[PDB]
């Protein structure tokens, strides 16, 4: 069972980033830890929990910044079915 406990070990490395202007770029061992997000989870519905947690501790970064979320994943390489940010409803997102 996939814990919020250890979805923020992820978010650690890609908080820095989330910090940074929209000058900075992502970090390597940040992207990786989204691609881990598929083994993270056991179902199907369960992998969504991943994006749910990170909408908890994205209310408790500090100067978080809401549009680098937006690149984080595009200059990472990934892409997903929604946006990544605290007003998108990751709650809609399909399987």
Known sequence: ALS???VSA???????????????????PCCAGVKKLLAAATTTPDRQAACNCLKSAAGSIPKLNTNNAAALPGKCG??????????T??????F
Do not use: F
């Open 78 to 87: 990934v892409s997903i079915p929604y946006k990544i940010s605290t007003s």
């Open 4 to 6: 919020c406990g250890t």
């Open 89 to 94: 409803n990751c709650n809609t997102v399909r």
């Open 10 to 28: 992820d978010l650690a490395p890609c908080v820095t980033y989330l910090q940074a202007p929209n000058n900075a770029s992502p970090p390597p």
